[PDB]
Structures are given as C-alpha cells and as structure tokens.
Design a protein around this ligand. Structure first.
Ligand code: SF4
Ligand code: SF4
Ligand code: SF4
Lengths: 134, 439, 292, 134, 292, 134, 134, 154, 292
C-alpha cells in the first residue's frame, strides 16, 4: 500500500464505477425473502479508465502498472464522481475516508494491461478496473 | 464413433482407483472425524488358539498380554508307557522380558511343572537350545529375531493325549531408536528394590499405592507409537507430546502398519498431526490456538463464510461399546457400554480394541466416546486466508460468531494459497479423567 | 392426494406446497410456498422462511426418503442459535400439498424426521430423512457385566422422585456452562450424582439435557458440578435445574445407593471363554461355589 | 532461441500489449484482502501485430513464422512503446533488458497463422500474439 | 510459517513457492516459482522446470498428503531417460514457501516422498505422496521354511567382502542389458551367485541395482550372467560392476556356502496342520526323533 | 424496509417491467398439459431504470443505492404504467396495494451499480432492476 | 381455461408462429432413418406478439397477463394467418377447431412480461410466445 | 515377450489427452518389495506351505502375498514368487497411447516394441477402446521374465 | 483385420461397419453402416436399422467387452413385440468391418452375446456383452435332497416321447395367456404334468417355452392349465402346444411316475450337521438301519 500519486490526469468519457455490495441472498421460492450484508461499507469498484495522450505519457503509464503497481499497492485513485455522511435520506451514509478528499486507494483488476498504438503519437488502453481495497 | 455407457465404466476404473491409492467401523469414523478413512482395525481375538501351519504371520505386542504362539520343531510323540514331546512355541519378535504364567487348553498349569526354556529372541543371536540336538548341531535352527519357548519332555497326560492349545503371558519392552533414548522403567529404573513386605489382605489401596508391582511392565505410549513408525521406516517421527501407558497392545503381522496404530488413536485420541515433515503425534486437547472472529474468515468456494453441518439425530451413536482385554486377571475379552440417558432408544455403535486395559478405564473410554461423538456432530466448512497460515492441520479454532463462540478442531486442509478447512466441533472438557471406581 | 382428484384432473390447478415441523419442544413451526400466510390446523404457516421443496424421492425398499428443503433462518424462524444448541434434532415434520384456494383439499406427501441440517451463508438446508430412519440402526444388549438401562426406563423403573433423591435447586455461577457452582449444594452426599440428567427447565436453555460428572462440594455445600458437554445455550445464573441421581450401573452401586436391585437388567457373573473350553481337572478346588 | 532480426518493419495501428502478473488473490470476504506476487518481473505480452504490404513482403513474412520461427526461437521484438529503471514513483521499476534497447525477445502465441489476400497484391494477417519468453 | 507472520499479516506479501527434491543418488534438484534462480541452501533452485504447485491437501488421519506438481523435463532437468531407468523412485522432497525478497523467511509445507510420476507430452506430473506413505503397507514374516533377510541385513550380518566372495570385475559384452558376458568370469564356482546384487558403479547406469540369474561360464571363464529385469540404462561394455554372492535362503545352502548359519532368521522345521489335529496313535514309530 | 422516498424523478424511455409467476409446468408429452400456480399474486419486477441528469443529481443517486439502500430496504417505487381490482375480464385482478397509489415497494437487483460519465456534467447508469419484495 | 376475449386488437408486424411437431427421431449413423410422431395434431405455437398503443391500453394489457391470465387460462387467440381440412395435397389436414373460427386457445410462454415506456404515451412489450394448449 | 508391433514414436495416433505417449510410473511406496504364496505341497502329505521372494535393495516393506489353491512342488513355488517379484516391479511402467486403425491387427493382448528417442522399452497392451481410433492402455513387459528360474529342489 | 492390411495401410480406405445377429430362433438379422444393402454371406445386411457402433472396448482380463449399438426398431426389424415377448435373449452376434467396395476384405471385431437391450423413444439400445459372459457366473450342485437336472438333460436321459407321456394336442381357450383351456384335456392323469415345458410351435408364439402349474381337468377332460409366467405373445386359440410331463424332482415321484430312477443325479439321504458332531450314546437304537 502506497501514497504515491493520484493517476495520470486524463480519463476518457466512460470511466464507470459504483459501490459493490456482497448482498448474500436466499431467494425463497415461495415469495418474499430475507437478506443481510456483512460489510457495513461498500467497495466503490471503479472500472473502465482510459489513458489517452502522446507516447511521452505512455512510458510513465505502462510503468505505473509496473513500478509502483506490481499488483498489490495503493496508488490513491481520483474520482470525478475525515468522514463523509449522506443526509438525503433520514438514514445516513457515514462512510469513512482513510485518504483525504475522495482519493479512494485502489488496485487494478487485471493480470495484464494492453496498451495500443493508434497513430505516430497516439497511446490508448481500453480499461483499468479497480475495487478500492482497504 | 461415439462412446457407450462405459463412460460410467471409465469413471470408476481407474477413474476412482486413483483416489484410494493416494489416500465395527460404526464408531471408528466419527472419532477420527471428517479426517480420513478409518481402516478396518482390531477384530479382537477371542479363543486364542495356536495353528501350526506355515501361513500364519509373526505377531508383535508391547507389554503384558497373552499371545497364542505357534508350533515350530515338534519332535515325534514319545511313549514312556503316557506320552512325551519336545515343542517349541514361538511367541513374538524382538527382545522380550521373561514369560510367566503359562496356561494351556483350559484353566492353568504351573510353570514349575514344566521344563520350558524361554528365550528373548535377541538380535545378539542366542545359540541353539541343545534340546534341538535331537536334530543335531549341523541343522539346529538358532532363531535370531523371534522369541521362541521350547518345552522339554512334556507329558501329554493331564490334557487328554492330544497337543493342547498353549497360551502364554508375554512381557515385551518397547524397542526402536526412539525407545533406547529416553528410557522408561523397563531399563530406566536401574535398580528400585524397596520391597514393602511387612506381611484376605489390604489391596484396597493398590491402585493408589506407591509400589510398582505389575504396572512396571506397561510401556509409555510415546515409544510404542515410535516403534510402529520405526518398523515402518519413518525415523523422522516426532513424539514428545504423548502421555499414556500402553499396558499390552497386540497387533498381528500384516496389520497394515497404520491399522495397528489407529486403535491407539481411538483410545488415547491423539492427533497424528504432521505440521511439518516431523509427523508430530500430539495428544489431543482443547487448547485453542487460533481465535478467529467471524470477520476474519476468507471467501470460500461455496461463497459462505462458514457452512455449518449438524449431523442426523437418527445417527448419533446413542450407546457405545468396547471389546477390551481384562489386563488384570485372566486375560479375557470383556465389554462395557455407555448409555446416554435422554436418547437410549437406539443407535448402538460399538468397536473392538485389541489392547489390554483395566475395568474403570474401559468405562472411562466409552464414557469419553459417547460424549465426543455427540459433540462431534457439528462440523464447520470455512476458508481462512493465508495471512495466518500457521494454523496447522490439527489445530483448534475458537471461531467467534454472533451466536455461539463454539470451538472447532480442523481437518482436511486444502490450501493452494487459500486455506480451506473442514473443521469439526471439539470441546475441552471431553478430555478428562472420568474418575470412576474400580474392579 | 385424498379426494382432490376432481381438483387435480383439471389442468387448471393451484396446489401450493406447505409444511409444518414439530420440534422436540412442544412448539411447531409453519412453512408454505403460497406467499400468503395460511392455516388449516392451528399452525399458522408462514411463508417468511423455509420452502424450496426440492424433489421428494421414494422407494419400496427400507431406505429413507429425502428432501433437502432449502429455506431461510430468521428471528421469527429457526434463528440458528436455537438450532445449534441442540434443538430440532428429532424434529418431526409432515409435508402437505394444500390447495390455497381451499385448505380442506390436502394430503401428506410423507411424514419425515429431518435428519441432516446444513446451515450456511444466512440460510439453512435440512435433509428430510424418511419414515424408515429408525430401521437401519443396531439395537441390542451384549451381556456385559454392567447394567443396560437408564433410570426412567421400563426395564428399571425407579420412581425417581420417591425421596430426597433429586436436587431441585436453582442455579448460580454458570461460568463456562460446564462448571456450575449451584448455591444450594448442601443436602446430599459428596459425589452423589455422577451420571445424572441436568434438566434445565427455565430461561435460555429450556428443557435441555446434559450429563453430570465430578460432583464435588468444596466449601459449605457449594457442589461444583462439571458436565461432559456444553449445554449449547448459556444458563443465566438464575435458572432452575433438577438433577436426577447418578447410577454407576453396577450391582454394588445398584443395591447400596438404590433399593432397586431386583430390576437389574444386567449380567453380573458371565463366566468367560476360558471356562467354556476348559475341561475339568481333578485337582484343587472342585466344590460348588461362587467361581468368584 | 535466436538473435536473428527485429521483424518486418510494418506494424498496423493497434499493435497492443502490456505487462502481466499472476498475483493470485484471496479477497477475504468480510474485510479487505491480502495478495501475493511470485514474479518480481513482468511478461510484456505484445499482441495484435498486423503485416500489411505487397505480396512481395508476404513470402518473407510467412516463412518468418516458419524458417527462424518453428515455434521455439527468439526473433527479438521491436516496441513502438543493461537495466532500465522507472523513477516516476519513489518506488522503482529496475527491470532488466537481456537484449539491447527495448528489444524484448519473444515467441508467437499461435499454433497457426492466417494470411489473407485483400486485393491483387494486398497481403494481410490479423494477429500475431507474443509473451516474451526469457 | 515460522516467524514470517510479520511479513504475512500485511496484505503486501511476496511469498514465492520453491522446492528441492533429493534423489536416491546424492544429487538434489532445485525448483521455484519465483522465475529468477534463487537459493538459500546449497541447492540453486532453478525456475527452468517443475513448479505448478497444485493444491497441497492435509489430514489428521494417517492417509498421505498429495500435490501433483506439474512441470517440465529437460536436459538440465529430470530428462526422463534418468527417470525411466529407475531413478527418482524413493525421491524425498521438501516444499518450501520462501520469500524471494529475503530467503531467510521460509518454512516447510510438507516433506514428501513423490510416489506416482506420470510423464507425457513433453512434461511430467508427479504426485507427491505425504509423510505417512510407509504406514498403510504390510510388514511381517510368515514362518516360512526359507530364510527371510537379505545379505546386508541386520538380522543376518555377513561381512560381504570378507574373502574372495564378491566379483569386482569390469564388464564387457553387455548385449541387451540382460545378458552380460564379463571378461573376467574365472575366479569362482560355476553358478556361485544366483541371487545377488549387480551394483554397477560407473558409466551410464551409475549405482543401479539388478538381480542376477543363470550364472554360467561357457568357456575359459566367460561367466555369462542373465538378469531378471533390464537395468533401464545400457551399460557401455566398459563399466565396473560388483556382484555379491547368491543366497538360496535355505539351511543347506546357508551353512555349506556361507559360514553364517547362526544368523539364520528362518523357520526350517515348522511341523504342519496335520500334526496339530493329530492324536497320537500307539502304533509304529513313537520314539523321539527328527520328525524328518 | 423503509418508507423513505419514491426515487429521483428522471427515468429514461425504456424503463421496462412486468409481473412474474413461477407456475411450474409438466407438458404431458402425448396430449395437452396441466400446470400449477402457487402464487395468487405477482412480483412486478421492474427493470432498466436510467438516471440521466447533471453530476449534481449523481451524488444524491449513488448514495441512494448506499445510504437508505444498503441492500435490504424499501424505497417505494414509482410506476409510470387499499386494493386495486381489474374488471376488464369477468375474472378479477383483486391485487393488494400495501403502499398507497401504485407505489410498489421494491429492492434493487444488483450487487453493484455502475455510473458512467458521458460529458463534463453528464451522469449515466444503464440499469437498476427490481422485483418488489413484500 | 376461459372463453374470455380474443386479445387487444394491435399486433405488430412480426408476430411469428407455426406448428410444432414432436418428431421423435433416431438418426441412424448409417444413412436413412425412420421416425414417428404421437400427436396426430400440431401445436400451433405462436410467438412474438407486441402490444403498441397508448398507456390507456397498457393497464388493460398488463392485467390481461395478470387477471384472467395468471399462467394457466385460455384467452382464445386471434390468428392473422367445426373442422378445417387442408386439401391441397391428396392427403388431408383434418385438424379440429375446438373454438370457432381460427380462435386457437393458448397460453403465454413466460414467467414474467416486460412492458416498456418509450414516450409520454408509448407502451411497448416485445414478445408474448404462446403454444395453444388444448 | 514376442514382439508383434514395432511402432516408432512417429507412428502413434493423436490421442484424447493430446499426448503421443502418456507414461505412468507407479509409486515406489507400493512396488511389492516381497511377494508370498500359499501353494499346496503336492509331493508329500498335502499341506499348505509358503515361500517368499525378497528383493535385495528394497526389502524395507510392501509385503504383497496371495493364495493359490493349486498343488505344486517346492522349487516351482520359489520359481513363481521369483517371477512375480520381477514382474510386478517391471509392470510399474504403464503407457497410455493411441495408435491408428491403419494397423488394427494389434490384438488386445499383443506387445509393442515402441521405439522412443530415449529407451525402446517394450509394452504389452490392455483395455483397447477403438471406435475407429485404437486407444491403448499398455503396460511394461520384458521378455526375460518368462523363463525357468532353475532352482534346486526339496 | 485379416489380409486387408494392403487396403488399410493406405490412407485412402473405405471400411464400413456391418453386423449380423443370429436370434435364438433360426433366423438372422442384418445391419450395416454402408447405407446400401450389401451381403457377403447369405444374410442380406440392411441399413434400415441398427448400426451406430459406439466404441467396442477390450481387455486381457476375463471381464466382457461391450458395445451399445444404437439403432432403430421397425416392422422389417426387431419390431419390439418380438423383443418384449422373450426373443433376442441369448442372441449371438458377430460384428464385421467389411469393405463395401469388396466384401471379401473383412474380419470379425468380436463375437458377442447381446446382454442388455434398452429400448425407448422409438429406438433400441442394446449392450453387446463380450465373449466371456458365461464366466463370472455360479455353476454347481449343492447336495440338496431333490434331483438336480431337467428332463432332457444328459445327467437324466429319459426319451421323453417313449410312450403316451407328451400331450401334443392343439390349443383352445387361451384367455389371458396364463389360463389355457385345451380342447383335448382327456388322455392322462389328473395333475400329471406340474413342472413341464409348454412349447408352443405354431402361430404367434412360435417355439416359445413356458412352465406349467395347476394341471386340473374340470369336466369331460378339459384340463385347465395355468402357467407361472405369461408367454409374452398371445396364442390365438388355434395353436399347437406340446407339454412334456412334470417332474417333482423327488425319489418317490421319480420311480413311481417315471421308470428312470437309476439316472437320479440327486442326494436323498444326506444325514445332517447334528449327526456329524454327535458322539455315539450307548442307549436306545444302535443297530444298523436306515436312519430314516
Ligand atoms: S443401577 Fe439400578 S437403577 Fe441404575 S441403571 Fe442399573 S438397574 Fe437401573
Ligand atoms: S542363507 Fe544365510 S546369509 Fe543368506 S539370507 Fe539366509 S541367513 Fe542370510
Ligand atoms: S425325477 Fe427323474 S426324470 Fe425327473 S428330474 Fe429327477 S432324475 Fe430327472
């Protein structure tokens, strides 16, 4: 786990991700059913990041996966979407922030990455799914 | 062309023949748990008879226990005119202590009446008995390992005129490389003396008395299980956690090695753990090593943090039975049973142990199984992360839950980088003396 | 089915499954597929739990029937602190196949015995062993030199309340549900009851049976008693237990402590194998005696 | 294993590839996780090469798979993206180069190739994946 | 694990598997998952082979543990001409779980015995039988009228080099690795060694044991000897073999050829079943004798 | 189970959903059939909701899943399609309404949600299925 | 089984359906093979109905599935494609009509339906497969 | 051991497991280090007897005996048990290959030479399952096993 | 294959499978994969049925070979009213592997015995048990006090036509194929044949064997006879049956009804276990007699 950097600034339109709940469920064939969750939090589970810049940005991005990445390190993640609460219900969110200001430390959900060359200077990679491991 | 319904045939052989390669029993399996498959063990020998064939195997025993022996080198019947023989009955292997209290077919014969010459069966290679100078020195056999007892000028008059089935009380000290280190009584004593004397009498305090007549024979459980793995060839055997007295176990030749050992795992209950390559044999206790909370289990295969199986009420072994050997008197097969008071309506589950132990101890063992087999109904099937991989395969987990905090000893650890566990419910109070009175 | 064939031979049918289990305690539980709470007997079947009803099997052979009956555990329901402690063991069920439009149109598929219950992941899965579960078990006596019966048994009737034998006293000092202090230890012998029934009739463990061991009174009639096994529900240091006396199941302990040596149902003498193949030698003791 | 040549010069826009890891993972179901890495390195795992030239280039490309290829030889690979380190984190890449200057010896990830004819002289083949065996 | 828990309780961990097998010959082999050659003991673990490490299992029961351990065979590696000939049979392994960042942070998962090795398609798959493989086998003597021990055994010590008993001569004429000509046949009796150890200590089959049969010298001390089985590695008509003498394991062949009739460990007389149920008839020979 | 709010007002064109039944069926192979119904009711089973507004609406929508959601609470659902009966056959619907006026209390059929960014202020999420647990 | 109504009048272009035959078959690997059918009729097996009208038509259509539907009732079906025979071969159809004039009583092949809203008044549902159970 | 096939390694078919020759070597812990019989004496008073054959290197365990109810002499019984202890250690190796129906005249009990790059070890075959692709579970068999042991008598 | 290796070693081959089964009745049936009717022997193999030919297996062990042989049943074919009635039981097959270009290039894969036939869904599936089906069965006599052989057997030859023993009469009144009226009942004793062979040699059940019981003549020589089992094919009240006489397999019924008491092949006296362990008491009858 690191505190190294946010990320390269660029993120394409389509960087999807929202909280994932265990939601162990019984599905009684009669009808209504009960359920419970053991988290009391929610893995934010961000996906579909895309780096799009020149090839000068690519070599600092492919080794972003490699050098401080490996697989098992933090690289605090910037959300385009210290305790934050959500008060729009009479219930509450009350979800903690270990890092400051929406920085949600994560890890990539990939054994490999796949960077493409689309023109003399264009560097693209289609997806880097994360899950914000605590 | 297509395939037939020998797709079921190739699913068995050798589709399942590869499994048992790399791997009454009614109560034997529950006591070992999920564990492993309990091998058939210890059909106790009643009416010990001596067969003079060539296909019977060499017996082995540890401590004071009767063994049948068999005939090797009997001379022809000699009529004095009303018969006479020269037997030699071979009891068991290894260096033994002396053979006393011979009784033939029937009750008892006095050994002073006999002309027997006992032999230890020493690896020192005892010479010829010279009663085999009937054969002559040039063909006299000189048995190295086996401990034969010759009989000289035996009158066949009191027991018919046929040969009677002789049975012999034998005392054999536990041997092997772990046994010669750490000597117990049988050579550790190095001169006790202090014979109380001071002469129907006052034997009511013999079970609590300081003097060591009779029970000096009984070998510690540490070296007998060391003798098994020594004879099997495992010298890497680790047995410092064992605390028991054997008092006359007996398994025959070709008793699988482990099936002789597996009777001891029912009596003294020990783990046969094998954390590392040492194969640690530790005595089973409730001493908790893990202390997992419910929050600290890993994500299993079946996607349940803890699958908890409670076994059927119709199979709980409502009453348990043994077939121990009397071990104080005339060594005979006996039986005690423990009956649970609420559910005595059925499920008799008994097994037979070929060792010899006393009367209050047998009711102690069956009192322990009937408690344990009803405790070991609950099994847990969870997965714990390799962040704490030092949970060895035989440890016991506290396993805090929202409802219960019930302990669990574990079996069948299959990890591959995700330790997945088939536990079983174990309480600490099961492993105690029952404190019962004697016979 | 019993005279719902007029309902059933029509393709338009509406038979919704439903079943009741009766626990070892007197209460029953209700379960239905119908998704609306319905009842025909005084059971009040609840669709809040139970009821996946997977594939009841049959057989003319003595082998049991089976139904795994997947469901849910909840506070109204089984709740699994009830189940783990030792209840629902010999729980008897009847599965029904009721018409929800008219619950008087029903039958029993089988009456089961619910052998193996596997709970996990917030749910339970309970194998319904068939009617013939008791067959397939060993029942017998083996001529052993102890007794063979329990105290309440017909083979040894005792009248277990006949004097100051039972210890009725309310409990204090429950500790780890194996040790029990017991405020009213005094009133009996030391080590009086060593194999008895610790029936606890109040509080959390209601009507739960354990077996005693180590009946020792340490000071001023404390009577610290162990048990073989946990009760599975913690007593709350205010519950009432009663402990029937302990039987060692031996002739000496039978006739001395208890009067009932007549109803022994045991085999004290039982000579032995070596007696059987023995031929009578004409030496030493050969007069009529005990052989003991 | 060879040191024979880089490759035919032509590579179409879309030649994708990025480093791998095994990094097996347990995902402790009631909290965070713990995960192991046995590599200390990364397979670069380049994919999706395309040859596009005349049919004169094709016969030197189909036997590139065959002659020095077979299956089990090097053919050092050119990256459009002696030890190189990556210093943009306070961690380090420090990944070795057995060959000189980004030449990453590989092998093709194919039992067969598939060259197509697109016009009288057009030669195309859609993919030749590699994994850079040491 | 042994005091790497500080390393392991952190989610950031890096434990790469690795193991060494010691063959029956003195050499060991190294294997690791780490993809870089590493060592902590003098073993030099190579990631060039071995190492898929699939699912070590455990059990409190006497049943063995198992790990199939998929890998690769190569010239540096096992190479399978070594494996097929008869090596790697009782090969002893230790699997380790080393930290590749610091190899002093390691433990043993189990110490195995590598029972079943299935090689195919240019690879090998080798089942790692657990520590308890020897248990589960039958060991015993059955009172048979031969001997029971081998020559070097403790139950019959012999000093097998004590005279001109062993035939140390170098080999010629290996033919089909069953027939062996042997240039120096002369020096011994005809049919001297019929059950002996053909230990071959040089060349291809280094330290490989076969059993002799048909010790016949045809002309001028040729001593053409067969074997029961192939050696599995071809000797190169220049190797050195030594052949210990042959024991028929019989009392007559014991005392005549060898002096060691004292250390017999056999059961020559062993009367029989028909003797046992026989009652003594008072006719014919009823005086004390051999019964042979 | 809550009584908290209907929902965010926005719902895209395509919010599909209709009642269910188990009604297991045997299909007697040599003639007609016979089939059983254990429900007497129907799960309304609404699917394919889409939130489409500014990013100001998104943070009150992602924590709608989180704060009063969790997994196991009501959030009464508004239908664009106290007992209501359906009298257009001579049979009857006679289906109850536990909540008032078509409000059908539900739960989301998701372990996770997936909100996307479509432009500087566009927030989209493609689906939130529900089944109306009692 | 009912005699309630035909259906809502609207059916979109694409309402597919044709007779379904058991046609138990042996497929001998030699060559030609024999076959037989146990029906002596043919399930007409109509699929892909679509309701498309205003939302006033939807509430009489969603409870068409529910009220007289459930799962297990008739609702005689109108075919846009008393005994009818087919005489265009020298063989004969001779297929019965239990209901009058092509009305073919059916049931929907669905555990649930899925009605969509496509605009302020547009109601759509993509499919209602039937099989005309006798 | 009379070889009927003479396959090279190039002449096997493509099997199911996509290996030309899967070769299984059995466990060392189960090789039957010593073998036993229970024959009948057949010359004297017919009584149950026993001989055993003990392999000199590995005598440490794996006793595997069986009982034959026929009657045979003394040198013959030690000949049989001498044959099994050699064969059961030879028959550790089994091969699992597939050979094409171009040579289907390999009957189910024949023995294959099976030239390899490393060895040229014979194999007798079992469990032929063809369906138009003869797939074989062979087993290792040497010729010299089936000979008289030439032992002295009683 | 037998000298089609010249055809077979070429990759261009054309061997199409084909087989003939010979029923218990004298007729054979033909089957081929070739899709054109072909023959080499007088069998006329038809591709109209049979022939999926799935995976003949082999084994040096005594265990049988197997081939499930999926196919079709039709009026020319097996037709399954033939099969269900009791034919095709011990049907013997030979599978062939003929060249359809030249049927003189063929061999036999195995000669089977067609044990288990499972028909369903308008098709049949018939397991071809191998040559060694008869091995694996128990054959023996157990010294029981009856006889042990059938009437036609070599161990008791009878000449079953030697007098008016057999009842040759044609059948009327077949009813439910268990009761048979028989117009010509008269000619024999009441209850003459109680265990006989009802061989029916005409009509539907042609050459089909049942066993008689309850040979009773009610009025004017009706001779209503039951059977143990159905014939499986209905006789048409005009068929001709012949019934061999009934043997009770007992010494009294042997010698009285039949003359052949010499060829008994039975064990009448067979003293008993209690005789064997009995020692002779010198009281009562101890003179030589029958012991019966
Ligand atoms: S001692 Fe008496 S009361 Fe107790 S169990 Fe035995 S017979 Fe019954
Ligand atoms: S003959 Fe002698 S040396 Fe040979 S095995 Fe027997 S006892 Fe040992
Ligand atoms: S009674 Fe005579 S004819 Fe009949 S079976 Fe017996 S021996 Fe044969």
């Amino acid at each position: 786990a690191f505190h190294e950097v946010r990320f390269p600034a660029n993120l394409s339109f389509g960087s999807v991700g929202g909280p994932e709940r265990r939601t162990e469920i019984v599905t009684l064939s009669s009808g209504h059913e009960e359920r419970n969750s053991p988290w009391a939090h929610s893995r934010r589970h961000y996906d579909a990041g895309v780096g799009l810049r020149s090839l000068d940005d690519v070599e600092r991005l492919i080794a972003f996966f490699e050098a401080r990445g490996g697989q098992l390190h933090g690289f605090r993640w910037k959300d385009w979407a210290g305790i934050v609460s959500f008060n729009e219900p009479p219930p509450q969110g009350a979800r903690v922030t270990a890092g400051f200001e929406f920085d949600v430390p994560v890890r990539f959900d990939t054994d490999r990455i796949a960077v493409s060359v689309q023109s003399f200077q264009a560097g693209d990679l289609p997806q880097v799914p994360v899950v914000e491991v605590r | 062309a297509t395939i037939l319904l020998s797709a079921a045939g190739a699913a068995i052989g050798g589709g399942f023949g590869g499994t048992v390669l790399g791997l009454g029993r009614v109560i034997d399996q529950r006591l070992l748990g999920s564990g492993s498959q309990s091998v058939e063990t210890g059909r106790v020998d009643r009416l010990r008879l001596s067969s003079a064939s060539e296909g019977e195997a060499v017996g082995r025993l540890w401590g004071r226990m009767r063994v049948a022996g068999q005939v090797i080198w009997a001379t022809r019947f000699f009529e004095s005119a009303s018969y006479s023989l020269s037997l030699a009955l071979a009891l068991c292997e290894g260096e033994i202590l002396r053979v006393g209290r011979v009784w033939a077919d029937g009750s008892e014969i006095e050994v002073s009446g006999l002309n027997m010459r006992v032999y230890r069966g020493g690896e020192d290679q005892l010479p010829d008995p010279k009663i085999a100078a009937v054969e002559g020195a040039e063909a006299a056999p000189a048995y190295r390992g086996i401990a034969y007892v010759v009989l000289e000028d035996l009158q066949l008059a009191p027991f018919g005129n046929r040969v009677p089935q002789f049975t012999f009380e034998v005392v054999r000290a536990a041997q092997g490389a772990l046994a010669e280190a750490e000597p117990d009584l049988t050579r550790g004593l190095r001169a006790v003396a202090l014979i109380p004397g001071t002469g129907w009498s006052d034997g009511e305090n013999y079970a609590r008395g300081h003097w060591i007549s009779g029970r000096a024979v009984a070998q510690p459980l540490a070296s007998v299980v060391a003798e098994i793995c020594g004879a099997a060839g495992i010298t890497e055997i680790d047995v410092s956690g064992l605390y028991g007295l054997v008092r006359g176990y007996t398994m025959t030749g070709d008793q699988t090695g482990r099936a002789g050992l597996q009777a001891l795992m029912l009596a003294y209950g020990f783990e046969a753990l094998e954390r590392d390559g040492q194969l640690v044999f530790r005595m089973r206790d409730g001493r908790v090593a893990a202390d997992l909370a419910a929050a600290d289990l890993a994500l299993g295969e079946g996607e349940a943090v803890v699958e908890t199986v409670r076994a059927a009420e119709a199979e709980i072994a409502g009453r348990v039975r043994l077939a121990y050997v009397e071990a104080e008197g005339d060594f005979e097969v006996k039986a005690v049973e423990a009956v649970f008071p609420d559910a005595a309506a059925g499920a008799a589950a008994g097994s037979e142990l070929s060792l010899a132990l006393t009367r209050a101890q047998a009711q102690g063992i069956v009192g322990r199984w009937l408690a344990e087999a009803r405790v070991a109904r609950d099994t847990a099937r969870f997965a714990l992360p390799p962040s704490r991989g030092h949970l060895g395969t035989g440890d016991v987990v506290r396993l805090d839950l929202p409802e219960g905090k019930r302990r669990y000893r574990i079996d069948r650890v299959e990890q591959a980088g995700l330790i997945q566990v088939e536990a079983v419910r174990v309480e600490p109070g099961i492993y105690a003396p029952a404190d019962e009175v004697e016979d | 089915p019993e005279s719902l064939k007029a309902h059933l031979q029509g393709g338009v049918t509406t038979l919704a499954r439903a079943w009741a289990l009766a626990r070892a305690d007197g209460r029953v539980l209700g379960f239905t597929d119908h998704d609306v709470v319905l009842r025909f007997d005084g059971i009040s079947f609840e669709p809040g739990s139970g009821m996946t009803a997977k594939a009841v099997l049959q057989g003319t052979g003595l082998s049991v029937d089976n139904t795994e009956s997947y469901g849910a555990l909840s506070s109204e329901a089984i709740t699994e602190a009830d189940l783990l402690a030792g209840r629902y063991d010999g729980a008897a069920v009847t599965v029904w196949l009721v018409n929800w439009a008219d619950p008087a149109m029903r039958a029993v598929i089988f009456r089961g015995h619910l052998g193996e219950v596997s709970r996990g992941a917030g749910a339970f899965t309970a194998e319904l062993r068939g009617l013939t579960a008791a067959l397939g078990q060993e029942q017998g006596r083996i001529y052993h030199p102890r007794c063979a019966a329990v105290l309440g048994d017909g083979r040894c009737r005792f009248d277990l309340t006949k004097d100051g034998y039972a210890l009725e006293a309310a409990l204090g000092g429950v500790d780890e549900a194996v040790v029990l202090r017991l405020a009213e230890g005094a009133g009996f012998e030391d080590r009086w009851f060593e194999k008895g029934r610790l029936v606890v009739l109040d509080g959390a463990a209601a009507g739960l049976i354990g077996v005693v061991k180590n009946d020792r009174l340490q000071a001023d009639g404390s009577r610290l008693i162990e048990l073989w096994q946990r009760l599975g529900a913690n007593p709350v240091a205010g519950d009432r237990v009663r402990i029937e006396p302990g039987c060692d199941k031996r002739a000496g302990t039978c006739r001395l402590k208890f009067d009932n040596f007549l109803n022994f149902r045991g085999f004290p003498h039982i000579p032995g194998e070596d007696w059987m193949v023995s031929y009578p030698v004409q030496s030493g003791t050969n007069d009529g005696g005990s052989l003991f």
